[PDB]
Design a protein around this nucleic acid. Structure first.
Ligand SMILES: Nc1nc2c(ncn2[C@@H]2O[C@H](COP(=O)(O)OP(=O)(O)O)[C@@H](O)[C@H]2O)c(=O)[nH]1
Lengths: 522, 85, 82, 62, 205
RNA sequence: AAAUUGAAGAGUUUGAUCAUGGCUCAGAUUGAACGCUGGCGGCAGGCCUAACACAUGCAAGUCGAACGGUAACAGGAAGAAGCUUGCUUCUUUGCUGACGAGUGGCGGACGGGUGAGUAAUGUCUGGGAAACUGCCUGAUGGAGGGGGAUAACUACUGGAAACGGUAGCUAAUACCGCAUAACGUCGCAAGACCAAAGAGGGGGACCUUCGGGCCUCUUGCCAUCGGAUGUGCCCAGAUGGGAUUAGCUAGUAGGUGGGGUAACGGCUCACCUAGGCGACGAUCCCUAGCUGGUCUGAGAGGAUGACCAGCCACACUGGAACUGAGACACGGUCCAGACUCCUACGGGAGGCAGCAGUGGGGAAUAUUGCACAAUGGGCGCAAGCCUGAUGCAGCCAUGCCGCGUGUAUGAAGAAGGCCUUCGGGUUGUAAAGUACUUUCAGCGGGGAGGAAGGGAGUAAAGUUAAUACCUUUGCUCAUUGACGUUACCCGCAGAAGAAGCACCGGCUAACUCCGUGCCAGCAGCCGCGGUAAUACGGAGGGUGCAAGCGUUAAUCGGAAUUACUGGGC
């Protein structure tokens, strides 16, 4: 029946800022949001083949729903970082996204193949800016271009990769005196942290003795699971280096569907254990449609991760949120774009349903009896509104269907022809977001269309106050409250509605893409 | 293609090569008889007709043409050679 | 190969076949040369749930008509030795 | 074509799409169609309580 | 598919007694059966041709508990049949199973007979029929099917089945809970007030 | 015996009338849509528009009992792996079950789809002659003998792949000559000429080169005449509208000769005649698949061709052919086009009007589903394999049918509403209360039938030469159902879980108040509303239908209103 045991299932997300390395590392993975699976036995053919479900994400603040609507389907998070920048405002964003869904994070500090790349500095950057408390799993060997491998704090070896063939024929090495002292330092600072899983580990180490790496890896995995720490690794996906050991760390610390407590559901309203459910092949079927897509080929394709249960090709299901009846014809699970039809999915899988004409994003698919709601009822608010018009005044039906389908796909992208005059206005989350929407309209549902033309409240870092207010006073903007919180400053301003027209993008370039706002008609 | 009707494509091409061979040979013998008949040598035409007759009947037997077509050839040629003198 | 087969008339979950001597090309329910008795597989007190037309079946099978599996079985059951 | 808007009160702007049926008005000379109320963003007559299927009014509780 | 309402409203709209109440006490003492059910029932409508035809047809429909669909069918047959259309129609109406149940007791009303038929409490010659429209055939039985007796309501209905014109085609057994259908009622075996020709012309209009 | 027995009017021109005359309504019907509402079951139905254009997933394979053979699994054989000469498993051997790819046979022309084209090359009805027909069947025979190859398996190369220049080849029921064949072909005659293939099962022998030979039977092969079937062809009648389409036609009509076809034929070529069709509508133009039938009608007739069945036609568009018994071929070939996809840039690959499904268009039409258990169909000795045929399941009140949503009782004729002549009436036995029942839904348990067969064993004969081996016909044995938590049956609880839609001026069944004031609004027709509106809106009441109701659209009727039946100037 089940091809791979549930314990040999990793549901990992690759989320970071922009161009931090996400897609590159994902390609190195396929060698050694787009959901895609792989079979990574191990680095030494150990760890009988695991099935790692990887959900590659965007890092743009425009597509923040495309990552938050996968965070609460994922079980683990692989937060990528660049080595020259480390924590960016975009990195802080997806970080808060993952903290909202309490994902057990590890980190992967990519771009050690660049000048100015550092590892210690980026670890401390994470510890200071975000708030995480990181345990360095690796330590780079080779500063910027000399980067050849890393040292482990468990194996105490050097995995210096062979650069003749891309990154596969790595060698294990003698961890030489290039860095063999800081290695010891951080190895001890790792042991001292893995001791933080039980009193019987305090008594274990405090005997003046270093415990065994087996029960150190188990302990650190416990810590990641309880979100107590975060394990950071070190690689270079572009120089084909460090990726396979990040995959090892994924196998060794990230959770399987059973390494967590059950998923708590709701029977008809909030009950004591209303529909708490655990990942098992024998449960009643329950899932969560984390993504709606618009198939180029079909125009409809629903992603879902089965939490508890086993559904089949043809099984009827209950839209417990919508209180309706859904059925199955084609189930496809494959790489980012390809589609390999299968027959049934078990708990812990991620597949694409078809003909699912009713379920919207975040709505729970389940058998006629399973949870009425499964959490996930919150996604952001559009921040940018523009109007639009096709080349011929009368193709507005084509345009309305295109922008009803794309709006179904992106719940953070509205459309409503405001009945003030008649104008069909489009509300996305970013300038590039709306560019993407318009070009998808021109390309998929081909209609060439040219775009056109309160008490605000803003938060921002307490360094860009002068400019944002200069910008607010630059606009016809009177203000309300000069109050500063603690992680920033809350600005309140009364500005026109025919105005600001791009205030989000003006604000993002102005605030270092680290500010939010709201403008709801005083 | 899609199915293994490509096998039948190969076989049809091969059979076309062979049938074209044999039909060309047969039609050539009949061209010989017709050139004799338009030459007028009732005896040379007779030899040519007796040369083609087993060929065309053997082909009809093989199925390359029909019994009726072979018999039609033989009847036309007998009529011609008999009026040929 | 002129067959003599059952033609599957009736209703859903309640069949009623008609023994039809038809060219084996045409569809089951489709074109047929002649019908020789019926067959009702769901009878309790009806006309045996079967009736054939044996002189015409014999005429056909003398003309070389092939008899299907169930129609052979029905000739068996009609011939009271089976 | 011209088409009546039956009932009491509508919301029809110039770009609203509506469903058109048959049935003239007999005193508007040249109007031979009726706007199907309660279909295609042409909402049904507010505060109707009798013949609500016509004028597309969902059953109040009352 | 069943008129769940005030039966006496129907009866006094017809003016006559359509028996939808157990004829055990009275008709006037339960409902003021001379005036139409409205607040304008004291008034008098003229009752033109179509009025009297519809009113007779509705009287029959309300007596037998049949709805307009399947009453059109009870006319379509008995128009297809041979003989008098209206007589064949009244016969096809007396053949209904709740009809013969009522006329043989086991329920003081056609609606009680409907519940009797429907709750699998009846057995036309042993075979449990529960289709209240089952057109019972002559020379057949009704067999009230033990565990459906001595519920005291079939007993009360058997007791109250007297004081009523005894059907010339039934031969009930009153406690043995058998009852036959020896032959279909002819014309004169019924109320004789029901002008079946009115209904025939209503449906052939 | 019965196969019918069937024909209704109303409103509206007028101050009123009678006619003429149109409009409108009452009916039946629908592949329906929309609004409101919606419990169940059964049986049906379901892209009417874009023959728009399609991604993928399946829709045609099968035979090892034709052959060469061994890629995969298994059985074994030899082990000096594993080892306690092994049960604790090393490789070679097609040897055997078997089987990837390959040669070969049969199928792939069926079944499934759509109605674009097609006004007659089509269809329907009824005849006819100038024909061919795989598989199926009957009759008579033959089934000697031999060669060269040729795929796979592979020498020199190409090619991302598809898949080619040469070769080394080796088989066959692949191909080829010969011998032989006449009630077969040609020929008036004489006469000349034409085919084939073998495979399997066991066995008394008895012979070997453990190849087998040999005797049998089971199939298969070749020829001819038959049947059945299927198909091709011809003819006559009929099968739309437009004459605001009257001339059209030059292979055109025919004749002769050659050629072609399975077959007759201007089918075709070359001559020759100058004919041929046309007011019975030729020609052109628009539209259209046709039929049984479906709706309607008392009929005659009108409209229609969804389902189902027969015929035709098409397969992305245009053309041609090849193989074959059968095609000018949905899931084959080639070319030209448009389109789409793949590419390493060098090249290719495809055609959902198959089943789902999709964009789109539209008022509007479903499941990228489960089985081949039934019945069929291809292959096969069978077993079996395959079948998006077919059987079932899903969705949707789309239709028809059936059932339920309680039954009896109940006068303080309650409260409340509404009307009121202020008495009261109506709501209304209606509710409540009391008694009883639990259909269906919901739980729980039992449980037909669609299942015939097939296979293994057995016996009897037929069988031979042999109790073998094959049939055939009984006996036993284990069994085969997707539907399926089947139908149906039994128990559990309690009236709980189940009623809405339109209408109420006349046609037309069913009335009052209030608020409104030619406004807002209604209206199928006539018409209503400008201060006492049963016509609008609400309320109370009532009428009809009911899990539907109404609206719109469409057909016939009514309409004797295209009048043939059956009208008028
Ligand atoms: N130098 C260097 N460049 C890299 C590395 N990883 C990725 N890149 C470059 O980043 C570019 C785009 O990054 P991308 O994979 O799209 O990451 P994204 O921002 O998450 O989409 C590519 O062209 C890569 O060459 C690295 O480790 N070193």
């Amino acid at each position: 029946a089940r091809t791979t045991p549930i314990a040999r299932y990793r549901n990992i997300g690759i989320s970071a800022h922009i161009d931090a390395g996400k897609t590159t590392t994902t390609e190195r993975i396929l060698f050694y949001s787009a959901a895609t699976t792989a079979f990574w036995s191990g680095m030494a053919k150990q760890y009988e083949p695991h099935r790692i479900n990887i959900i590659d994400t965007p890092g743009h603040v425009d597509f923040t729903i495309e990552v938050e609507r996968s965070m609460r389907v994922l079980d683990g998070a692989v937060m990528v970082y660049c080595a020259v920048g480390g924590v960016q405002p975009q990195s802080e964003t997806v970080w808060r996204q993952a903290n909202k869904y309490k994902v057990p994070r590890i980190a992967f500090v990519n771009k050690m193949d660049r000048m100015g790349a550092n590892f210690l500095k980026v670890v401390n950057q994470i510890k200071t800016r975000l708030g995480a408390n990181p345990v360095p799993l690796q330590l780079a060997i080779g500063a910027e271009e000399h980067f050849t491998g890393v040292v482990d704090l468990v194996k105490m070896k050097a995995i210096n990769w062979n650069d003749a063939d891309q990154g596969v024929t790595f060698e294990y090495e003698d961890i030489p005196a290039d860095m063999v002292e800081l290695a010891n330092e951080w190895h001890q600072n790792l042991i001292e942290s893995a001791a933080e899983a039980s009193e019987e580990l305090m008594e274990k180490y405090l005997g003046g003795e270093e415990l065994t790496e087996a029960e150190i890896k188990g302990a650190l995995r416990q810590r990641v699971l309880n979100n107590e720490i975060i394990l950071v690794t070190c690689g270079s996906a572009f120089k084909n280096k460090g990726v396979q050991a990040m995959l090892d760390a994924v196998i060794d610390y990230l959770p399987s569907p059973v390494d967590v407590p059950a998923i708590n559901g709701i029977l008809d309203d909030g009950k004591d254990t209303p529909a708490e459910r655990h990942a098992s092949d024998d449960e009643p079927f329950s899932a969560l449609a984390f993504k709606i897509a618009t198939d180029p080929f079909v125009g409809n394709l629903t992603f879902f991760r089965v939490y508890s249960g086993v559904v089949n090709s043809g099984d009827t299901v209950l839209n417990s949120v919508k209180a309706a009846r859904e059925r199955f014809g084609r189930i496809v699970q494959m790489h980012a774009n390809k589609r390999e039809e299968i027959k049934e999915v078990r708990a812990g899988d991620i597949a694409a349903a078809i003909g699912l004409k009713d379920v919207t994003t975040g709505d729970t698919l389940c058998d006629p009896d399973a949870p009425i709601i499964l959490e996930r009822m919150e996604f952001p608010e559009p921040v940018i509104s523009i109007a639009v018009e096709p080349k011929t005044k009368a193709d507005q039906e084509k345009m309305g269907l295109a922008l009803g389908r794309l709006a179904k796909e992106d719940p953070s992208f509205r459309v409503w022809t405001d009945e003030e005059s008649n104008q069909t206005i489009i509300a996305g989350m970013g300038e590039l977001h709306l560019d993407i929407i318009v070009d998808r309209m021109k390309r998929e549902f081909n209609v060439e269309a040219n775009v056109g033309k309160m008490k605000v409240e803003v938060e921002t870092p307490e360094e860009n106050t002068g400019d944002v207010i200069g910008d607010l006073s630059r606009r016809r903007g009177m203000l309300k409250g000069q109050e500063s919180e603690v992680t920033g400053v809350k600005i309140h301003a009364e500005v026109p509605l025919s105005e600001m027209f791009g205030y989000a993008t003006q604000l993002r370039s102005l605030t270092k893409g680290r500010a939010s706002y709201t403008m709801e008609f005083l | 293609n899609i199915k293994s009707a490509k096998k039948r494509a190969i076989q049809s091409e091969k059979a076309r090569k062979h049938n074209a061979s044999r039909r060309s040979m047969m039609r050539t013998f009949i061209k010989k008889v017709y050139a004799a008949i338009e030459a007028g040598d009732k005896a040379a035409a007779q030899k040519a007709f007796n040369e083609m007759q087993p060929i065309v009947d053997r082909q009809a037997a093989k199925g390359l043409i029909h019994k009726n077509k072979a018999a039609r050839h033989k009847a036309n040629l007998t009529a011609q050679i008999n009026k040929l003198a | 190969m002129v067959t003599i087969r059952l033609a599957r008339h009736g209703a859903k979950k309640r069949p009623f076949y008609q023994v039809v001597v038809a060219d084996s090309r045409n569809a089951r329910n489709g074109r047929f040369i002649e019908r020789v008795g019926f067959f009702n597989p769901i009878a309790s007190e009806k006309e045996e749930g079967t009736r054939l037309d044996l002189d015409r079946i014999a005429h056909w099978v003398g003309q070389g008509a092939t008899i299907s599996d169930r129609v052979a079985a029905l000739i068996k059951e009609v011939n009271k030795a089976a | 074509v011209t088409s009546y808007i039956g009932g009491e009160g509508h919301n029809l702007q110039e770009h609203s799409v509506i469903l058109i049926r048959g049935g003239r008005v007999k005193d508007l000379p040249g109007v031979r169609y009726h706007t199907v109320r309660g279909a295609l963003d042409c909402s049904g007559v507010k505060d109707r309580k009798q013949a609500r299927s016509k004028y597309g009014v969902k059953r109040p509780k009352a | 598919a069943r008129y769940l309402g005030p039966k006496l409203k129907l009866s006094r709209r017809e003016g006559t007694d359509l028996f939808l109440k157990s004829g055990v006490r009275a008709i006037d003492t339960k409902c003021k059966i001379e005036q139409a059910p409205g607040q304008h029932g004291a008034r008098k409508p003229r009752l033109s041709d179509y009025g009297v035809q519809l009113r007779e047809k509705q009287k029959v429909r309300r007596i037998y508990g049949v709805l307009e669909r399947q009453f059109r069918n009870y006319y379509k047959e008995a128009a297809r049949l041979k003989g008098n259309t209206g007589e064949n129609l009244l016969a096809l109406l007396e053949g209904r199973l709740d009809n013969v149940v009522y006329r043989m007791g086991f329920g003081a009303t056609r609606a009680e007979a409907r519940q009797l038929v429907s709750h699998k409490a009846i057995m036309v010659n042993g075979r449990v029929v529960n289709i209240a429209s089952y057109q019972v055939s002559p020379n057949d039985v009704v067999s009230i099917r033990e565990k459906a007796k001595k519920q005291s309501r079939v007993k009360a209905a058997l007791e109250l089945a007297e004081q009523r014109e005894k059907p010339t085609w039934l031969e009930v057994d009153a406690g043995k809970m058998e009852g036959t259908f020896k032959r279909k009622p002819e014309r004169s075996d019924l109320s004789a007030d029901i002008n079946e020709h009115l209904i025939v012309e209503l449906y052939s209009k």
